[PDB]
Design an enzyme around this catalytic site. Sequence first.
Site, mmCIF file in Angstrom:
data_model
loop_
_atom_site.group_PDB
_atom_site.id
_atom_site.type_symbol
_atom_site.label_atom_id
_atom_site.label_comp_id
_atom_site.label_asym_id
_atom_site.label_seq_id
_atom_site.Cartn_x
_atom_site.Cartn_y
_atom_site.Cartn_z
ATOM 1 N N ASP A 452 0.842 -1.187 0.000
ATOM 2 C CA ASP A 452 0.000 0.000 0.000
ATOM 3 C C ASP A 452 0.883 1.245 0.000
ATOM 4 O O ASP A 452 2.088 1.179 0.258
ATOM 5 C CB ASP A 452 -0.942 -0.010 1.211
ATOM 6 C CG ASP A 452 -1.931 1.138 1.200
ATOM 7 O OD1 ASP A 452 -2.247 1.653 0.109
ATOM 8 O OD2 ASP A 452 -2.379 1.536 2.294
ATOM 9 N N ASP A 528 -9.453 3.644 -1.360
ATOM 10 C CA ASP A 528 -10.342 4.018 -0.258
ATOM 11 C C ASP A 528 -11.663 4.544 -0.804
ATOM 12 O O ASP A 528 -11.858 5.748 -0.974
ATOM 13 C CB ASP A 528 -9.662 5.042 0.640
ATOM 14 C CG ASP A 528 -8.459 4.471 1.358
ATOM 15 O OD1 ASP A 528 -8.458 3.252 1.630
ATOM 16 O OD2 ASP A 528 -7.518 5.238 1.647
HETATM 17 O O1 LIG Z 1 -7.090 13.527 7.136
HETATM 18 N N1 LIG Z 1 -5.951 13.760 6.369
HETATM 19 O O2 LIG Z 1 -6.102 14.314 5.095
HETATM 20 C C1 LIG Z 1 -4.641 13.396 6.911
HETATM 21 C C2 LIG Z 1 -3.535 14.246 6.876
HETATM 22 C C3 LIG Z 1 -2.309 13.841 7.389
HETATM 23 N N2 LIG Z 1 -1.146 14.699 7.371
HETATM 24 C C4 LIG Z 1 -0.001 14.438 7.967
HETATM 25 C C5 LIG Z 1 0.879 15.531 7.692
HETATM 26 N N3 LIG Z 1 0.162 16.366 6.953
HETATM 27 N N4 LIG Z 1 -1.035 15.852 6.778
HETATM 28 C C6 LIG Z 1 -2.186 12.586 7.941
HETATM 29 C C7 LIG Z 1 -3.272 11.741 7.986
HETATM 30 C C8 LIG Z 1 -4.477 12.146 7.474
HETATM 31 N N5 LIG Z 1 -5.603 11.261 7.527
HETATM 32 C C9 LIG Z 1 -5.432 9.848 7.375
HETATM 33 C C10 LIG Z 1 -6.112 9.397 6.097
HETATM 34 C C11 LIG Z 1 -6.756 8.036 6.258
HETATM 35 C C12 LIG Z 1 -6.865 7.319 4.937
HETATM 36 C C13 LIG Z 1 -6.051 6.064 5.003
HETATM 37 C C14 LIG Z 1 -5.742 5.505 3.649
HETATM 38 N N6 LIG Z 1 -5.860 4.100 3.780
HETATM 39 C C15 LIG Z 1 -4.711 3.409 3.313
HETATM 40 C C16 LIG Z 1 -3.995 2.915 4.535
HETATM 41 C C17 LIG Z 1 -4.851 2.099 5.474
HETATM 42 O O3 LIG Z 1 -5.758 2.929 6.062
HETATM 43 C C18 LIG Z 1 -3.947 1.612 6.569
HETATM 44 O O4 LIG Z 1 -2.831 1.065 6.012
HETATM 45 C C19 LIG Z 1 -5.585 0.988 4.753
HETATM 46 O O5 LIG Z 1 -6.622 0.518 5.487
HETATM 47 C C20 LIG Z 1 -6.175 1.414 3.436
HETATM 48 O O6 LIG Z 1 -6.578 0.306 2.745
HETATM 49 C C21 LIG Z 1 -5.240 2.216 2.562
HETATM 50 O O7 LIG Z 1 -5.912 2.681 1.459
#
Ligand SMILES: O=[N+]([O-])c1cc(-n2ccnn2)ccc1NCCCCCCN[C@H]1C[C@](O)(CO)[C@@H](O)[C@H](O)[C@H]1O
Lengths: 854, 87
Positions: A452, A528
Site C-alpha cells: 500500500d 479508499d
Molecule cells: O485527514 N488527512 O487528510 C490526513 C492528513 C495527514 N497529514 C499528515 C501531515 N500532513 N497531513 C495525515 C493523515 C491524514 N488522515 C489519514 C487518512 C486516512 C486514509 C487512510 C488511507 N488508507 C490506506 C492505509 C490504510 O488505512 C492503513 O494502512 C488501509 O486501510 C487502506 O486500505 C489504505 O488505502
Amino acid sequence: VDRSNFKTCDESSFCKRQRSIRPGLSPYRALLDTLQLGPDALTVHLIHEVTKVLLVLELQGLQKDMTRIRIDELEPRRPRYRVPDVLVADPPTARLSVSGRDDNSVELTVAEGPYKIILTAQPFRLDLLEDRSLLLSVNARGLMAFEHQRAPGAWEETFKTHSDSKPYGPTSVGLDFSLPGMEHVYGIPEHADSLRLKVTEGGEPYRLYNLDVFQYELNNPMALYGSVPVLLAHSFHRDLGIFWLNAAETWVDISSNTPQTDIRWMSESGIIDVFLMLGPSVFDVFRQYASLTGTQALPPLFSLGYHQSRWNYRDEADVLEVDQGFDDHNMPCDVIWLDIEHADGKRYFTWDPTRFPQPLNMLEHLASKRRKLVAIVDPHIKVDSGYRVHEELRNHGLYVKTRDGSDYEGWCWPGSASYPDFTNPRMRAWWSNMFSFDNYEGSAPNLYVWNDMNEPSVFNGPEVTMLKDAVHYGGWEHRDIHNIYGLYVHMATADGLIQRSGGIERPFVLSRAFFSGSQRFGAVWTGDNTAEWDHLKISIPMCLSLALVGLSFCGADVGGFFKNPEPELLVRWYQMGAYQPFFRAHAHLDTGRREPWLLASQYQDAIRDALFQRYSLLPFWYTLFYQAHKEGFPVMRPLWVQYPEDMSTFSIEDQFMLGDALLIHPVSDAGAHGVQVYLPGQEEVWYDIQSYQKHHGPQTLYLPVTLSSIPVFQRGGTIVPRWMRVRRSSDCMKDDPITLFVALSPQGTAQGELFLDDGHTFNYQTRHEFLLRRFSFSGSTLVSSSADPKGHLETPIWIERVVIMGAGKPAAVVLQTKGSPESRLSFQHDPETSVLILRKPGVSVASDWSIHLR
Amino acid sequence: YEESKPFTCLDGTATIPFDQVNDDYCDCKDGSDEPGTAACPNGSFHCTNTGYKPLYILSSRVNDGVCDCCDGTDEYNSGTVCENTCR
Ligand SMILES: O=[N+]([O-])c1cc(-n2ccnn2)ccc1NCCCCCCN[C@H]1C[C@](O)(CO)[C@@H](O)[C@H](O)[C@H]1O
Ligand SMILES: [Ca+2]
Ligand SMILES: [Ca+2]
C-alpha cells in the site's frame, strides 16, 4: 475530497503550455532526404520550422499488426527517459518497404500488406491504413509538441508551499491521434468515472499520475492511485488500441467530431513512445497488448476466495476469534488480513511485541484451519537508528536522494520516513531477499503481502507524493519515473515471495499503485472507497476499465472503506463482490466491526448465500484466470466485448460478463423491487441460474428481486464447472468432485473448459503438471477431451453430477470411458424447467469420456 | 437363497438400494444417506469421541483436511492424520 492540494491542468505548467496549443497547422515537417530504412525500423529527421530544432522519428511495423512510433531529439544535451522493465521483450519487427512516393509523401508497406503507413512531409503526419481503409492518423490536428532540453513556472515552480527546482527546464512532449469512425473510447485507468470515457473539451483532461486522494469523489477525472496509459476504441466495424509508453505525469484530452474521436497525450518528460494496436477485433487488441506487457499472473487458488480484512484486528486472539467465527457461523473464508497496526509502530517486517508476540504460532493455527494470512508492507521506511531495515538501506545508499546528495525524508504512517529507490535493481534485489524466512522473522509459507501507499504517498509532499526533483538510480529525476514506482514495489515484493520458497510457490501481492505491466505481479484494488450506494455502483466501471487494459485481478472494498454501511448496503456489496475478481471486505479504523455474522440473521443468510455461490464457482474463476494468463483475455468483461455489433451495449456499466458464459446484474439500489437486465444476442438464449427459466435475446427483462437475489444468467452454448460441496476454505475443496452445468444453445450445443493443477505452485509451467479439459455437447452427446495434451496431473477430482438446462427427458443415459465397461447412469428430469440431472458419472476428470442421451 | 432390502430416506423423499448409502453422492434431501461422507450439503457426521463428549459436525468438514473431532475420525482419507486429543 479537498481539491485545492491537487493541481488542475492550469496549475500544471507543462499541461498549461501544451493545452494552449490548439488544432492548427503543425510547424513540424519531415526531411525526406534524411530518410533511412534500417534493419528493424525507418528513421527520418523532423524539424520545427520556426525553432529549427531537429528530432528523429523511429517508425516500426511490428509482428501481430502493430506499429510503434518513437520520437527523440537528434542531438540532445542529456538523454531523455525511456521506460524500462514494462515491456516483457523486444517486440519482433516486420519489414517496411517504400511502395509509393511523391514530393511531399512516402507510402510504406508493412511486410507484404495489407497494412500501410503514409508519411507526409509538410506538414508532418502519419496515416495508417488496411488496404485503402484509413484506420488512424497521427498529428492530423497538428498538436504535436516536443520541448527540447535547453541550457540548465516553466523552470523553478512552486505549488502551495512546495518548490520544484526543475533543473532541466521545460521538456514536455505531446501528440494527437485521430480515430475515424470511433465514437466510444475506454481505458486509461484509474479514475472514479464511467466506463465509456467522456469528452474533455469543456473541462479537465484525464490525468495519469499515481496519487493518494483522501475521500475521492465520483464522476470526475482526477488522477487516482494507478495509471495505465492504454486507450481502447470500439465501433461496430473495428477495434483499436493506443499504448502511450510514458512513465511521467500524463494528461489525456478527448474530443468528438463522419463520426470521429481525437485523442491527445501530454507528458512531462521522456520520449514519445506509442504503440498502435490495429485489431481488428478487441480480442486481437488483447493479444497485441499482452505480447508487449505480458499477461495476468496466474493467482494461487486461495487468493480467488474470500478475504476478510479491516483496519485493524487487535491481536492474535482477535485474528483467531475471527477465524473461529467463520466456522461457527458456517461461512467460507480463505485469508485474514493484518493492517499496519500489526507491526511495531509502523516499522514494516516487524510485529508488535505485545499484540503479536508469537506470529509463527498464529500462522500455524491458521494453517491447521487451512487458511492464509496477509500482512501489509509499505515502501516507506521509518527513520530510526534502531530499525535494522533503515540502517541497511542507509548504509548501502539505496534510498531516494535529494539534489544535495542526502537521503530524501518525508512524512507517512511512522512519522519521518525515507523511501527506497525501487527503480534501482540492487534495491529490488535487497527487498526481494528481505522476504526470506530468515530475514522476515515470524513469516511462514501461508503469509502473503499487501503493498500500500506505493504511489508513493508522502503526507508532507506536493499533492501528497514525492518531490519532482528527487533523484533516482542513474541520475533520473522523480518526474521521469513516477508512475512505475509502485510497479517496482509490486514486482520486488512478488519476486521475494517466489524466492523465499526456492522458486516453487506462486506469489500473492495486492498493490494500490500500478502501471502497464502490473498484471504480471498480482492484484490491485480501487483504494479508499466509501460505504455509499453510488460507490457500490462505480466498482463495475472501474474494474471493467482495468480489465480492458490487462489488469484482471481487480476489486473494490466490500462494504466501502470509509463510513458504516447499512445492512442492506453491505448485503448488496457482498453479492456484488462475490462476482468480481478480487473479493475482500475492508474497513476504516473508526468504522464499526462488520464481520458478516455480526448482522441480523436475514442479512447473514444472504451474505452466506453469496459466499457459497463464490466458492462453488472457483473452478470457473480459476479457468478464466488461466485463460487470462495464457491468452491475455480479461476475466471481467463489458457486454460490448462479447457483442461488438450491439451498439446499445457500448456504454453499459451496471452489467458485466464473466468470460463468455455468465451475465451479472447485481442489485445496486436500496429497497429495489426489481432490475432491468439487458440480455443481448440475436438467436441467443439465457438461463436464470436460480429458476432455470430460459429467456431469448435480445430483450430487456424486468426481474423481480428480494434481499437474497443475485441476478445471474448463463448463456446458452456454455458449460460452467462448479464445486457444489462448499467447505470452509479453498484448500479444503481442491480435491473435490466437479458438477458441470450445460446450458444448451438453440442448436442443442454447448462447450467449455476446465483448468486444474496443485493450486499454488509453478509446476503447471515447469513440469506441465496440470489439466486442461474440453467439455463439448452436440447432438445428444457430452464429450470430455483434452484441450492441452502436454498437461498431466495426479488428482482424485471426478465428475459427480451433470446439470443440463434446456433438454428433454431421455429414455436412457449411457456413459463410456476408456478403460471401463459401458455404464448406465440414472437421471432426474423436470418437465416444467427442462432441466436434466445426470447422477454420479463417477469418472475421473483426467479421463476422456462421453455421455449419450438416448 | 435369501435377499437384501433397500434404504429409505428419513424424510421419505425416496428409497434407494443400500449400495447408494455412503457412496459419496447425495441422494436424500435431508442428507441421511451419507452420514459418513461429505456428499450432502445438509448432512451430519457423528464423532463418537470416546473419553470425551460425542459431537456432531457438518458433512462438509468430513475429509476437509481439518481435525474437527477429538478422536480424529472425521479425517480418514484426506492426507491429514489427526491425533486423538479427547483428553
Ligand atoms: O485527514 N488527512 O487528510 C490526513 C492528513 C495527514 N497529514 C499528515 C501531515 N500532513 N497531513 C495525515 C493523515 C491524514 N488522515 C489519514 C487518512 C486516512 C486514509 C487512510 C488511507 N488508507 C490506506 C492505509 C490504510 O488505512 C492503513 O494502512 C488501509 O486501510 C487502506 O486500505 C489504505 O488505502
Ligand atoms: Ca448416496
Ligand atoms: Ca474435518
